[PDB]
Each structure stands twice: as structure tokens, then as C-alpha cells.
Symmetry: D2
Subunit: 430 residues, 4 copies
Amino acid sequence: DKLPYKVADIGLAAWGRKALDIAENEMPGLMRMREMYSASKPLKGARIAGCLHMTVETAVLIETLVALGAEVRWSSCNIFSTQDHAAAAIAKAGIPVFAWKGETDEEYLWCIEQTLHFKDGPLNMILDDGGDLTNLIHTKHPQLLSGIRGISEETTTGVHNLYKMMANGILKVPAINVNDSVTKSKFDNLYGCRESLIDGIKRATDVMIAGKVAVVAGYGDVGKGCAQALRGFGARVIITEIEPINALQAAMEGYEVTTMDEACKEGNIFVTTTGCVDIILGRHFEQMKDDAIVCNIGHFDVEIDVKWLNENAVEKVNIKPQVDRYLLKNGHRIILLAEGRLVNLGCAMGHPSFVMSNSFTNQVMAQIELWTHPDKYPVGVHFLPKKLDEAVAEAHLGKLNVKLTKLTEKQAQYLGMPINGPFKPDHYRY
Amino acid sequence: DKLPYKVADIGLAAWGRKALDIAENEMPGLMRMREMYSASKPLKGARIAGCLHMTVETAVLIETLVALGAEVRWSSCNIFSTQDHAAAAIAKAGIPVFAWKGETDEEYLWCIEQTLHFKDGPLNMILDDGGDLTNLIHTKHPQLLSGIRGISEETTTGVHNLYKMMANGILKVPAINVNDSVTKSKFDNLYGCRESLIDGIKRATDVMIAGKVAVVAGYGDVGKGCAQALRGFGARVIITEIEPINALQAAMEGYEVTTMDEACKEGNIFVTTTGCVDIILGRHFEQMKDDAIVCNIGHFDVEIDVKWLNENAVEKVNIKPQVDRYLLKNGHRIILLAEGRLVNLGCAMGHPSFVMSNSFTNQVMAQIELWTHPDKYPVGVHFLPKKLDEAVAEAHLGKLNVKLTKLTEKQAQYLGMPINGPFKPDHYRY
Amino acid sequence: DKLPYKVADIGLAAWGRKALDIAENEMPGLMRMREMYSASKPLKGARIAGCLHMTVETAVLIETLVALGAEVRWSSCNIFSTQDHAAAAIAKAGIPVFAWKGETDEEYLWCIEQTLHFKDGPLNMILDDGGDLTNLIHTKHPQLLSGIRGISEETTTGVHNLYKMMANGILKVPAINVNDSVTKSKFDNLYGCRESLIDGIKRATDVMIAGKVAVVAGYGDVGKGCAQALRGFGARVIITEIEPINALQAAMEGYEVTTMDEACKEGNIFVTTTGCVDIILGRHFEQMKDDAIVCNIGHFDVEIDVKWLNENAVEKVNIKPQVDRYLLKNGHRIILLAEGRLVNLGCAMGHPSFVMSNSFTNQVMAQIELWTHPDKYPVGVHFLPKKLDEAVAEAHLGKLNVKLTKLTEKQAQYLGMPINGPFKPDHYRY
Amino acid sequence: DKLPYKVADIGLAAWGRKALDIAENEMPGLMRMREMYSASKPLKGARIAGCLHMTVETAVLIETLVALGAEVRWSSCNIFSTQDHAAAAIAKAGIPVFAWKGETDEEYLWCIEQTLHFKDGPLNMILDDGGDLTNLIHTKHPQLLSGIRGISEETTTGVHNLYKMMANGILKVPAINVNDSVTKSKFDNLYGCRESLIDGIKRATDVMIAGKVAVVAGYGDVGKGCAQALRGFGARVIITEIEPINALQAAMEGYEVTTMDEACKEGNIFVTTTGCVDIILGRHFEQMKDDAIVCNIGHFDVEIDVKWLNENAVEKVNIKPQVDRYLLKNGHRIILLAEGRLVNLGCAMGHPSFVMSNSFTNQVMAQIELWTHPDKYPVGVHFLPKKLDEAVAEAHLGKLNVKLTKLTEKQAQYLGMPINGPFKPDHYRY
Ligand SMILES: NC(=O)C1=CN([C@@H]2O[C@H](COP(=O)(O)OP(=O)(O)OC[C@H]3O[C@@H](n4cnc5c(N)ncnc54)[C@H](O)[C@@H]3O)[C@@H](O)[C@H]2O)C=CC1
Ligand SMILES: NC(=O)C1=CN([C@@H]2O[C@H](COP(=O)(O)OP(=O)(O)OC[C@H]3O[C@@H](n4cnc5c(N)ncnc54)[C@H](O)[C@@H]3O)[C@@H](O)[C@H]2O)C=CC1
Ligand SMILES: NC(=O)C1=CN([C@@H]2O[C@H](COP(=O)(O)OP(=O)(O)OC[C@H]3O[C@@H](n4cnc5c(N)ncnc54)[C@H](O)[C@@H]3O)[C@@H](O)[C@H]2O)C=CC1
Ligand SMILES: NC(=O)C1=CN([C@@H]2O[C@H](COP(=O)(O)OP(=O)(O)OC[C@H]3O[C@@H](n4cnc5c(N)ncnc54)[C@H](O)[C@@H]3O)[C@@H](O)[C@H]2O)C=CC1
Ligand SMILES: Nc1ncnc2c1ncn2[C@@H]1O[C@H](CO)C(=O)[C@H]1O
Ligand SMILES: Nc1ncnc2c1ncn2[C@@H]1O[C@H](CO)C(=O)[C@H]1O
Ligand SMILES: Nc1ncnc2c1ncn2[C@@H]1O[C@H](CO)C(=O)[C@H]1O
Ligand SMILES: Nc1ncnc2c1ncn2[C@@H]1O[C@H](CO)C(=O)[C@H]1O
């Protein structure tokens, strides 16, 4: 009746597995959570449904969750983010995976629907990225809200919607803001994008960054990381923002801050990092230099008005998967990446292992908090314990040969902190 | 009986005044506070006692406070930080200033004591930087605690002590953590030091940064700013930390993290940014390469064990004010800057105007909150309203020609934020 | 009898063609050479044999040479550098191309041999990269030296051998050092590598650069570019050199300079940019951290002793084309890229179009000088006219929206240079 | 009759001496030339007249020359570059020095004239920086050209004039282009300015670099160094050039290149590095944002039309020595630094010791070549032997703990270079 799993080519298992193994060596935190909670199986009895890009980095997550006693059913939260060799490794491993690269919007839904019912019954835990899973249930299958003990949100856009649902009393189950974890936002969002953005642009366009003008919308952690990447390759980065502080920041870094209306005329590479709609409109496409490269790294695909291009370009020619060159009426051409979808995951392989390890460690910690200490998490949206947070960072120091210092009784006194204990207040922003 | 003011040479007034005027053009926020509250005189009735480095930047602060109706009596919170031409300008302006560059520790106290009693009676407000003023009274003149309505703390070390006093029930008056203001910590502590540290080292030693090895203790905002400075000139930066997160950060930036015990052997320039004691000991001085330059930018002078040097060096020769070259017993020489005291303010001119403007604006806002809305500030230590915070940033965007963007009703809707109102949650760390 | 061309899959033409067209838009110089010398056909009568990585960038070169009246027969100077879609586009265009990705060393020779005889007879012009073509003939087919009018050398290693052949009186035909062209060495070697090195590492390993230790051997233009790339991602770069100046340079940039003997113990990514043998030996592989990534970007494959690995590792497992993971006896694993071959071209797509345009324009200019002004080029090795050099740079300013300034008669006088003419002496190093 | 020496305050000797000693420790090459040729006194019989900024770094040069047997008479080649404590140290040392800070253009000449006649008769050697000395004699005292054995030129502007004199057969004595020395142009011109420019701007204005727009005219080594400095502090750098290559360079680094005519409207700090006249005119001053800071780091003072300001401003108010604030007619103010003169030397202390040691070493080597091997240097302008050049770099590696690598007989063979000998061709540009 139901399918055991759904993937592109399970014959990609062997290669995926090699990829997973190589990656495991790069994710200290994840492997540390394994070496510590494999026997106790803290996630015993858990039936987790997760909506996250099925990548090699995600397979190591899923496997770590299964190692901790959980039962998992997975789906990608992106139609192009899946890494078919990593997905055929999780299926063969015997885990039910319904994901492949290039699913029609319609299949994207069916895949999530498969992960809603397990052997022993429906899900009782949600691991989300983007918000699609926690919303599909809240609005389509509300009868399951009662059997779900918690929610784990990976990205900014997802967490923004949680705070919203709660604001309008729509959130019926507890959730942990995993994104806002210092070791998540300041490392995954910032450093991950600094490396994985260009990987997406390059692999798809093979364009030269040096000498070009790059326009980045939004100066959040993702923006700061994308800007520093481009700018560090010889590109001239212009930044657009709606926030005074963030903007004063881009300015105090040498970046020129102005409106997209004025910038669209100068840039060659446009990257949207803001988490809101209508960042790049037809009114802009009409001013862009020939063959401008437009991509978006925010979570969803409405920052760039693709429909406009689709309904206003003389012709569209697909160069290769997730790379289209449009011919406007003024003759210029617009190279669109991943149909306005996430560029790093759509055209590249996403963030590198080491950084994803920080995020996924917070993700496993969260599931264990929600599924084992329900009391501390009443309906609403909470942060992961500062202690747990500082634990992720600490668990990655050894791989990098980092040598922390130690206070002396005398020092620990001076400050008033614990020579071996915490000293950082929660006002600390890092 | 009592003195009207005490400064080095009041004949420096004319030059100071020009300095102040040139600076006023660089401090938008301060001038904006003047152009908005000069008639209402919100600080009317206030008798402020401030302990802050008497600099040109501070003169523009004091004058702004007087412009808002306040009565002010000043003193520097450092024996070497004073800028005699700016102090002789405030004195001539008719404001009682008791400060000069190079006071004996004994004069340093008398100076603060002068600013405790005004014409109309004792102080009723405290503007502090470092914690000396709010402590001099809490422990030496407790009878005045009753007449003080509030406290304004400039720096980390000062705010750390406030949180401490409160912890042990020693704080008898309210205070506002000005340092932790995003537009203060992320701009003054980080960007100010990135520019003003080297200004201190250079003016004193004229040392070449490129090619050297620079060891920076502590990776807080000050540390990150100092590291990026040195590292940006061609120096090789090594970082020492006691915090996992901060350390994983230094690491993810290309910086080598290890202990001072190992690092003291490689470095040429040592800069302590940590806010605790015994960061550099004699056990280290004995391993430092010849003519190593040691300086401290943290707030107080015990990070570097100067006493050791003083009691263990074969000889000490003063090159010029605040620059000493010591001859150890192994023959090497150790160039000490400002006797372990703040290097940027002792050997240079402190942070540049534009950045101090952000900090001092928060400082003026604070005084107005404490002296006008006492109800909102019960004994303890509070942050300055996020709204007031984001107001400092916003008031400096024009001078930098920064063009903010504006959401459309449609967008403001999408997000759920106010097209013209705030959208940043307090979890935001920036 | 003889084959018309030899490629992998000529059905890749359509895709290649699109790639070529997109690239043409990025190579101003090349297209400018076409729009100026297509009618005159200055290369009329020319029968060029070229040994250069058959890439999309190289197809635009070949086609430009045919546009100028030349007759071309091509071959790749690397067994892994070929770009099969770009090669099937040149074959379809009707140009004899003998090249594919992954040829056996034996086929690599047959391929070059095919390009030695044209319809109208043997070659009369040599376009080389690496030195293999001008050496195959000088040593294997010396009877052809008489019919060859000149030589064009693309890379440092190739040009180093020319100066050598000449030194021992082995060079029987004139050659132009194209590499040493300012617009070639300072743009292709430095900026090209700064972008294309990591493209190779990433595409193959997908490794995270931030937080790692990268060892780069040699601080030439290639070294400087690779160091800045890595270092710019958050990696810690150590450099090894044999030259005082170059080393003092790395040092004055914050880079630690030491021997490979000491560094092999700390690095995670090893990149050889030196153009000499035995840079990385077994004695090193035995000290590298687990899963260390080793790659070479110099021109030939003997910088890294791959034979040792091949003859001393417990086992070798191929992850995917041009990516091997070795199991040493101490248990550590060594991920070797492209079998010690050129990493950017073996695992990625090489330098980006725009930069290659500079180098290839110098390459076309050179053929025109050799084939049209033989007099000015007597047997030996010459530089390309500074005028022609400064012409490449000039021809790319427009695409970048660069606005040069113009001296006034008054200024042109002051300096003594020509208001519209050259003013840069040949001592200028840039 | 004649004066023994002329300085500001010889009581500054003691302090200067300490300065000299601290500096000597930073100049390895200079001290190495002393430890090797002090006994042989290769400059015995020499009567050197030098026109170079009398700085602490220059005293170590002069003393090194005297240590090698030379007789010296000095003068500053700038009216504001002199460092009075370093000059009063050379005078006390018993060396005739005629230089102070702030001499009238008239005294500037008298000072040079003093250094033309020694005890044993007139000069026989010229050490110049700028060209004033070799020109004062070639045009005012041609009778001495016969007794001068050689010329040493420090800076680009000076060397450009030599090549000129020669071009019009005006040069009557041999000269060595010291500037063009790789270890001079690529270290002093580029790295020295990257550190000493801002030292000049900061000490005089104390302006904040972050957030500002900085316009640099000319992308030579000086330009590249200044741009990287400002840009590295958070400023936005625009560049103007007249050369295609240099310009394509600035572009490939992320810098916006345009005309001063368009840029004068955006910048806040203007820095001329070009070696030509009329870079900044009144037509520009009339468009600059209020309180714009204008300075020039080129060698002479005509890059900025100061006369215009002087003849067109409503008023000029001197803030402090070498700092003037002008009031234009449109109301804006223009802060001029050092009256258009060299900013790093006029408002700061010039390049740091370690870098000056490279240039001054080349300067000593040159004097020894000219005065001892006159044969190898016929009338004209020559470069210093590459061997001697590579010897400066080499002599500074130890202070920086740089560990060079050593080829093996096997490698030395492979390349064809000498395992212990040179391998770098003269085409190398670095
Ligand atoms: N593909 C990936 O690897 C990753 C994607 N993300 C996604 O990126 C987005 C942003 O993440 P963060 O940097 O953490 O968000 P953020 O909230 O820190 O920053 C986005 C910034 O955009 C600004 N902004 C909003 N509307 C704007 C407009 N119309 N024009 C200009 N600026 C505007 C906001 O003020 C804000 O500062 C989210 O949707 C998140 O899900 C986050 C991390 C990784
Ligand atoms: N002179 C100036 O212009 C300024 C001075 N300051 C002063 O600098 C100090 C630090 O300020 P922030 O960066 O805001 O503080 P911070 O608290 O953010 O960072 C100091 C860092 O040092 C680390 N640390 C503590 N003890 C250590 C030890 N023994 N070894 C290594 N690392 C250690 C701490 O974990 C912390 O991350 C304070 O005393 C503050 O008052 C702050 C701003 C400007
Ligand atoms: N794959 C590519 O895209 C490109 C490859 N190349 C190749 O890269 C190589 C180097 O090119 P360039 O930077 O122009 O050469 P280069 O001669 O400027 O620099 C190589 C440096 O290595 C140093 N070196 C030599 N032997 C060494 C050793 N045993 N240990 C440490 N350092 C050592 C040399 O002193 C020299 O400074 C050449 O073989 C060239 O063909 C050049 C340009 C692009
Ligand atoms: N104050 C100091 O410490 C030092 C000063 N200098 C001086 O700086 C000047 C330049 O030195 P280098 O960088 O070695 O010279 P350079 O010749 O390498 O570069 C100057 C650049 O200016 C460009 N240029 C000329 N006229 C121009 C104009 N009207 N607009 C825009 N660009 C223009 C030229 O094409 C050239 O690339 C010389 O006068 C030299 O004496 C050199 C070294 C140190
Ligand atoms: N390789 C990857 N595997 C899984 N999630 C990823 C990867 N790269 C980026 N992400 C996440 O993508 C979301 C936004 O969908 C994040 O919050 C990132 O942490
Ligand atoms: N020029 C200056 N004037 C006043 N305070 C300053 C200056 N430079 C730095 N500071 C402050 O010094 C303290 C630490 O004493 C801070 O928190 C900085 O904001
Ligand atoms: N895509 C490419 N096509 C052709 N040659 C290239 C490419 N990328 C790098 N090269 C050249 O590779 C040599 C060394 O083989 C160079 O000198 C570079 O200019
Ligand atoms: N402190 C200094 N002492 C002597 N010459 C210097 C100093 N700083 C810069 N210069 C030189 O100034 C010229 C241009 O006048 C140079 O070529 C620099 O090498």
C-alpha cells in the first residue's frame, strides 16, 4: 500500500556511504552525541518526522538520531536541495526516505505526507527547516497536533513563523528556536554562506567574481557572510537594508548601502539574503547589465519575481539543470539560478560538513530536550539552554587544535565566575 | 576654599576649542541630542558627576549635557587618558574640570572628590566609566547614595561590577548598562579599538606591524577589533581565550588559539583585551623575544604584572612619556606601554569621534531616562530601551550617506512587522 | 587513414556551444581581436599546432585564431583538463580536435602527434602551454623545426624550459614568453588561481575551508593567489619558500613561513604551487593529520610524490573521478586530488573566462607577431611588446565599467609623458 | 664663518639617542652592513652630501655610513619631514646636520648649500631623495659635477627625473636607481605607506576611517598600499588612474575606478599618490562634502592646488601645526594636511624602521658600488645588482623568524638552478 521509501537511484548508495563516512570525520559534535547517547538511547520511543534538505550532512544527522534510539522518516524541504547519493544511502540503510533532486511541487508534498505515519502509529516529534512540516500539520492535519511532543526549527524563516503562529495563538505544540543558537546563527548562517554561496554561483555559472559588482539584499548573518565572500574575491559589494543598525554596520565595513532601485543599474551578481518578498522586480530586471547573474539564498523562492521574467522575457533557454538564461525585450540576458530557489543548495552542495555539525548538534540536543523534559517546554517557542549551546562550540575545539585557557582560583575569584564554570551573561551577543 | 577647576594649562583652550568644533562635526548623534532637547532642557535640575577620560570627545558630551540643562562636574577615569587641550576648553567654558594628563594615583582621587558637591548641594546623578565613581560613593560616602537618582556605566568592566554589587546586595541606586547597547558594544568596543589600538602602539613605538607576531588575550568585541587590526597590517595574530564559543570564533577566522604560556615565546606585540588579572606574568616576560612590545587595552592596569618587571628587571629607562624599555636579566629588552594602562588612551587619543558619538549618545539618552522616568528604573542594572538604542544607529546614517530601504504595505504585511515600525526581536545579537 | 578529430562524445556539442557563447560575452579581448582582424586575416597561411587544456575558454581562443585566417589542429596539455562539451563543439565546428577528459598517458601523446601534419603540409606555428609540444618536436621530430616560424608559451614552467633550451643551445625556433606578460602573470596566475583553486578543492572534496590549516608551497603569483583565497575563507595559511624576497613578502602579509618538514604536521590542506619536484614526500605523508587533503596546482605532476603513496599505502579507494582516499599504515587517510595533477583544471573548470581572456589575447597577439614580423624575433625567447601588453588590459576596462582619467597638456608636460601616449618605464613591476 | 650644524634644539639629543637605539634594533640590514664593513671602511675617502628626511631612521643610515668610513653632511628633503630629536642626536654625534621641522622654503635651500663643502673640499658623492640635490648642483653649481663620483636616488619622482636628465643629455654623473629595487619599491613604497599614511591622517585629524569614502589617485605601489590601508579599516575606496593595467588591477581587487571629476563628489578623504600635477583642483574642492580631508603622499606638493584654496577660501584657520581648516564660499570646510606636502612624514613619523631598513640598506650598498667600482657605472642611471638586491631581503629574514627552504642536489638539478645559488630571472616582477 504505502511506499517503504522513495528516491532517485538507490544504486548511488555505495558512493553516498563513502561520502557519509568522509563527512562523519568532519562532524565532531554529531559523532560525540553518538558516542555519548547511543546506549542510553534517549530518543527511545520517538517517531520523528523531519523536513530538511536531504544531504550527506543530513544523513549523518538522521543516522545519529537513529543511533540514539529514534525512529525516523525523512523528506527534503527543497525540491532541488536533495543529494541523491546521500538519499540512496539512507534508504538502503533501511530508513524510509522520500526525496530526490528535482521534484515537482506536487511530489514535494506527497513526500512530506509519507513521513507522517509510522509503524507504531503517527509522528510524535517534528524536526523542521523552513516551517513546511509544522504548518502542513497545523493547517491540514490538526488531529495530529495532540500526538506531537515538540518541534525543532532549523532556519530563520521557520523560526519567524513560529513566533508568528504563537502571536496569533496558532501554535499548538512546543518548539525550540535552533537557528537563534549562537553556535548556529553565528557559524552556520554566517560562515556557512561565506563558503557555500559562491560554490553555488561558480558551479552553475563558472563566472569570475573578481572585478564584478555584487549586490546583496539584507545584512543579517547570511548577508554579512555573502558580502565578505564576494568582496574577498575582488568584487565590489553594494548592500541594501531596511534596518538602521545593520546598515550602519555595512557602512562601517566599507560597503556602500543604497536601494535596489539605484543598485540594479550597477551590479552584475544579485544575491537576496533578506527573508521577505519582492526584493528584485521586473522594474529592476529592465535595468540590469547584460547577462546579470541573479540568485537568492534566503529560505523561500519569492524574493526574486521569477514569474515576471517567466511572463515577460522574449525567450528562456536552459543552459543546464537549475540554470536559465533569459532574453529580455531590451536584448540583455538574465542568468537565473535555481529558479529563484536556494542557490547554495540548489546549484551546489550546501554548507560544508564541519559547520553543519554545529547546527545539527543543536538539532539533536533539542529533540532530546523536548522528548525527555517536556515540562521545561510548555507550548510556545524557546531557546536551547545556553549550557547546551556552549557545548556544541566546545565539542568542535579539538578537531581544530584549539587550546582553551584556564582561569586560576585567583582569577576565577577576581571575576566572580567559576574557574571551571560559565561566566558569559545572556546579554552577550557575540 | 574649594577649587573652581583644576587642569594643566588653561592656555590650551583656544586649540582645544578648535578641536572640539572639528569633532562636533563628526558626532551626529550628540549634536542631534542638542538640537532636540536644548529648549526643553530635560536634564534641568540635574547635578551630574562624571568619571570619564577627559577627551575632546568627552567635552562634546559634557557640553551637550549642559546644553540639555544639566549642571556638570568632571574628572577623568584614567591618569594618562586626559587630553589637556580639551580639558582647558571645558574649564574656560566655565565648567568645573579637575583633570590633567599624568596625575599621581593620589591626585586621581582628589579630582573625583571635587566633583561630589555642587553649588546647590551634592550630586544627584552619576555618569561613570570603569566603576570608580559609583564605588567611591558606595564605599566611602554612603550618605550620598540617597541623593543620587541613577547611574550610567560606560564600559564592560564597569558594568560587570554593577551586576556584581547587585548580586551581593551592594547596589543602592539604579544604573543603566550603556556598554551592552548594540550601538555601543558593536561599534565602540569593536570598531573603535580596531582603529585606536594601533594608534597607541604606533605613536609610542613607531613599530612596524607587518611581519610581526601579535598575541591578543581575549576575543571579546575589543579582542576581535584588535585582532583584525593587527592582522590587517600583515602581523600574525595568535589568540588566547577561556571561552569555547569565542575561541571557536577566533579559530573559524584563521586565528591560532592557544595559551599565553606557549604563545609568549612567539609574539612580538602582546595586547591584553581580557578584563581580568594576571594575563601576562614574569614567567612569560622571561620567554619573550628581544624588545617585545607589551600593552593592555582592557580597562584596568593589572592584566600585565608590571610590579614584577619593576621588581625584577636589571634596569628601566624611560624612552619618552608612557614608554619604558626594561632590561631583563637574560639580556632581552621589554618595551612597556603606559605602565600597563590603557594603551589607546594613554599613548594615543582614544577612539575616533564618529564612534564615540554612538556611545555618548546612549550616555545622554540614559541620563534622561534615569532623571526623568525614575519609575521605570528600580534599583538594579538595566539596558537602554531597544528603541532608544536603534535611535543612535539611525541618527548616524545620514553623515555616512547611508540610504535605508522602505518596506511596502505588502511587505510589512508579509513579515508582520510595521512598514515604518520595529521588526527586530530582542534575541537578535548582531 | 588519419583521423579527422578525436573526442569523447560529439553529442555534447549543443551544450558546449551555449557554453562557448556565454563565455564569449566574458572575453572582451578575444572578441575585440576578432572584430579587428577577421577581414585582414593576419594569420592567413598559418598552420598552428597547439597544446593547451581544451576548455570552453580555449575554444573561444581557437575560434578566434580561425577567424583571423589561421588553420588549427588542437590537443590538450593535460589528461584531465579537457572539457568534453567544449571539445565536441570545436570538433563539430569542423576543427580537428583530439582531446578528452581522462586519457591514458599513451593517448596523451598520440593526440599531440595528430596535430603535427595539416592538409597543406606540417605545422609552421606552435601554441604551447607546459612545453610538451615544442619539446616533442625538438627531440622527436627535429626535421620539422625548419618549417616552424615561432613559438607561443603559456605558462611559467613552459617558459622556464625555453630559457633553458636556449641556454644549452637547444632552441631552434623563436618563442614569445606569453606568461611573463604583466596582464598574464599578474592576472591569470594570481587572480585566476585565487578563484579556481578552491573551485577544484571544493568540487572534489566539498571540504570546509574555514578553521583549517592550509600549507602552500611557493609564494609566486600562483602562491600569493592561493594563499589569499584560502586565508580569505577562514583558513590558517602557512607558506614555505626558497627565495628571501618572496618569503619576506609572505611574512609581511601575516603568513607564517617555515619548512614543509615542520608544517606537514599542522596542515589539513596542502597545495603545491612551486614548479619543482619533491615538495611533498612520504616522510611527510606519515605526519599529516587524518584525512589531509593534498593537491598540486603547479604545472606538472611531480611536486607530490604520488608513487610513494601508491607504493606505501595499505589501500587506495577511489571516491569519484580524480579523488582518491588512501589508507596509510599509521591508520590516517590521505585524500589525493587528481593524482597530483593540476587541481583547478583536473577537479574543476580552470580559471574563469574573463581572466583567461587576458592571457589568450596575449596569445593571439603573439602568433601575429611571430607569423608576421619574423624579423623582430630571431631564435631565442622574447617578451611581447609592452604596447601590446598594455593593450590587453586596456581592452577589458569597458566590460568592468572602468573610467580611465586623462592627463591635460599641462600634466603630460609636467611628467614629460604623452598626454595620450605611454608613461610607464620597463622597470615597472606592478 | 660657516656653521658647524643647524638644528632646532640640540637638547633633544638624549631622547633622540634612545630613539636611535630602539630603531637600530629594528633595522637588521643597516646593522649588518655595519658589522661587516666597519673595519674595511669601504667608504673611506668619501664625502657624502645627502638630501633625505632627517628622521630617526635616517640617523641610523648616516651613522652606518660614517661607520663605513664616510664623511657626511646632511639636510632634509622636506621642510616638515625632519624629526628634531633625531637631528639633534646626529649633530651631537658630531655630524654636521642642517635641518629642523618647519623651515621656510628659503631656509630649505640654505640648508642644502651647507652640505656642499667639506673640510677636505667639496662633495664627491650624492645621496638623494626627491632630486633636489642632484639638480641644485647640475643647474646652480655645475663646477662640482666633476668631483662627484656617483648619485643615489631614493624615490620614484627622483628616479623619473634622472631618466629625464639623461634623455636630454643633462646628467653629468652616474646614478643608481635605488627606488626600483624590488626590496625597495615592493616593501617601502607598498608596505611602508600601508602603515604610515593613516598614521599621518590620524595624528592630524584623528578622523574615523570606518564608514568613510576614500579617494586615492594613482594605483602604483604607493596607491595599492594606501588603498589597502583605508579599505582595511572599513572605508570605501575609489581609485582614479591613467594606466590600463594598473586600473584593471584596482578593478580586479574590488575597487571602483573613475575620474576625480566624478569622485570628488563622494569621497571624504582624498589621497594623491600619483607623481604628477593638478590631481585635485578648485573645480573639485567646490564639490567635496563638508570637512573633507585632503592630503598628498606623492613626493612633491603640487598634486593638490593649494594656491587655489589659499586664493579662494573665505577664511583659513590653523587647527594645529600642519593642519588647516578652510571655509569655502559654499559653506563647506576643507581640512588640508601639511599644506599639500607629504602627509606621512609631515603629520606623522614616516615609514616604520623595519621597512626603512630595506631601503637604506640598498642605499648603503649603492654608495659602495659607485665609490668603489666606478667602472661598472658609466654616466647614466643604473639598477642595483639583483644579487645585492636579494641580499637586503635575505638580511631581514632572521628578525622575522623566517625559515627558508633548501633545494636538494636533486632539485637544484631538476630546475637547473644552483642549490645554493640564484634561480630568479630578471623578468620576475614580484
Ligand atoms: N540557504 C542557506 O544556507 C541559509 C539560508 N538562511 C535563510 O536566509 C534568510 C535570512 O537569514 P538571516 O541572515 O539569519 O536573517 P536576518 O533576519 O538576520 O537578516 C535578513 C535581513 O534582511 C533585512 N531585510 C528585510 N527585508 C529587506 C528588504 N526588502 N530589503 C533589504 N533588506 C531587507 C532585514 O532587516 C534583516 O536584517 C532566512 O530566510 C533564512 O531561512 C539562513 C541560514 C542559511
Ligand atoms: N580602552 C578602550 O577603548 C576600551 C576598553 N574596554 C575594556 O576592555 C575589556 C574587555 O571588553 P569587552 O571586549 O567588551 O569584554 P569581553 O568580556 O567581551 O571579552 C573579554 C574576553 O576575555 C576572555 N578572557 C577572560 N579572562 C581571560 C584570560 N585569562 N585569558 C584569555 N581570555 C580571557 C573572556 O572570556 C572574554 O570573551 C573591559 O575591561 C572593558 O572595560 C572596552 C571597550 C573599549
Ligand atoms: N594551474 C594553473 O592555473 C596555473 C599554473 N601555473 C604553474 O604554477 C607554477 C608556478 O607558477 P608561478 O607562480 O608563476 O611560479 P613562480 O616561479 O613565480 O613561483 C613559484 C615559487 O616557488 C618557489 N619554490 C621553488 N621550489 C620551491 C620549493 N622546493 N619549496 C618552496 N618554494 C619553492 C620559487 O622560489 C618561486 O618563488 C608553474 O609550474 C606554472 O606553470 C601558473 C599559472 C596558472
Ligand atoms: N611619502 C612616502 O613615503 C613615499 C612617497 N613616494 C612618492 O609617491 C609617488 C608615486 O610613487 P609610486 O607608487 O612608486 O609611483 P608609480 O609611478 O608606481 O604610481 C603612480 C601612479 O599614478 C598614476 N597617475 C599619474 N598621473 C595620474 C593622474 N593624473 N591621475 C591618476 N593617476 C595618475 C600613474 O599611472 C602611476 O601608476 C612618487 O612621487 C614617489 O616619490 C614613494 C614611496 C614612498
Ligand atoms: N548541506 C546541508 N544540509 C542540511 N541543511 C543545510 C545544508 N546547508 C545548509 N543547510 C540549512 O539550510 C537551512 C535553510 O533552509 C539552514 O538553516 C541551513 O542550516
Ligand atoms: N576618546 C575617548 N573619550 C572618552 N571615552 C573614550 C574614548 N576612547 C575610548 N573611550 C572609552 O573608554 C572606555 C573604557 O574606559 C570605553 O568604554 C570607551 O568607550
Ligand atoms: N580554463 C582554462 N583554459 C585554458 N588554459 C587554462 C585554463 N585555466 C587555466 N589555464 C592555464 O593553465 C596554464 C598552466 O597549464 C596557465 O598558464 C593558465 O593560464
Ligand atoms: N622615516 C623616514 N626616513 C627617511 N625616508 C623616509 C621615511 N619614510 C619614508 N621615507 C622615504 O620618503 C621617500 C619619498 O620622499 C621615499 O622613497 C621613502 O622611502
